């Protein structure tokens, strides 16, 4: 559900 830009 939540997107997070890869580190």
């Amino acid at each position: 559900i939540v997107y997070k830009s890869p580190v």
Partner: antibody
């Protein structure tokens, strides 16, 4: 210069398939996601999904999980979108874009589905 | 889906004017919201990310604000080069969604 260069416009017969390319340059290809977007003149943009070339993970909009396959080729720095079982509804301009924030966009690829 | 509801659908203003447009989120959730400019036949260009942060190389004639779940794009000192369609992007929850767009016409 970050640049995303997409393949030419394509004419495809209904029921057939099309593979669209997005060649990235100006940054390290395996450090940013690539997202794909559909644009039709009367519908307004729809998000298709994304690939992270780093680990080749993918996510899809449910509307497109059956029709779209996102792949990547780190040696040529190219992302691909395969669209299957094409119908007149699939006629549109397709964009690739860098990152979830979409800070750079390709120029778009116009697909015509027609016999 | 957390959809973005955009209005107005079009806008007609004079050179030098201040113009605004809004996207309202379809759920009471915190989201990261971007604004884009797209000219006919061209690729979108990012203006504003995170509701109010100006993308590098974009004029500060462009600005964004957030009031609750209402997001506003403002354009001051309107110029011919600003004639375009503008849309927002919700990029927190999958699937990402876009507002339906605001087409900006210049009076003469």
């Amino acid at each position: 210069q970050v640049q995303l260069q997409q393949s030419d416009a394509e004419l495809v017969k209904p029921g057939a398939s099309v593979k669209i390319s997005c060649k990235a340059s100006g940054y390290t290809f395996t450090d940013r996601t690539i997202h794909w977007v559909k644009q039709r003149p009367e519908q307004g943009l729809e998000w298709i999904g994304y690939i992270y070339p780093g680990d080749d993970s993918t996510k899809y909009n449910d509307m497109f999980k059956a029709k779209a396959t996102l792949t990547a080729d780190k040696s040529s720095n190219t992302a691909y979108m395969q669209l299957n079982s094409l119908t007149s509804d699939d006629s549109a301009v397709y964009f690739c874009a860098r990152r979830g924030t979409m800070d750079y966009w390709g120029q778009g690829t116009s697909v015509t589905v027609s016999s | 889906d957390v959809q973005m509801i955009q209005s107005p659908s079009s806008l007609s203003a004079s050179l030098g004017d201040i113009v605004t447009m809004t996207c309202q989120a379809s759920q009471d959730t915190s989201i990261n919201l971007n604004w884009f400019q797209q000219k006919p036949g061209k690729a979108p260009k990012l203006l504003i990310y995170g509701a109010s942060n100006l993308e590098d190389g974009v004029p500060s004639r462009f600005s964004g604000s957030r009031y609750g779940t209402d997001f506003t794009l403002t354009i001051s000192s309107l110029e011919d080069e600003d004639m375009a369609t503008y849309f927002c992007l919700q990029h927190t929850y999958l699937p990402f969604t876009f507002g339906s767009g605001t087409k900006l016409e210049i009076k003469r």
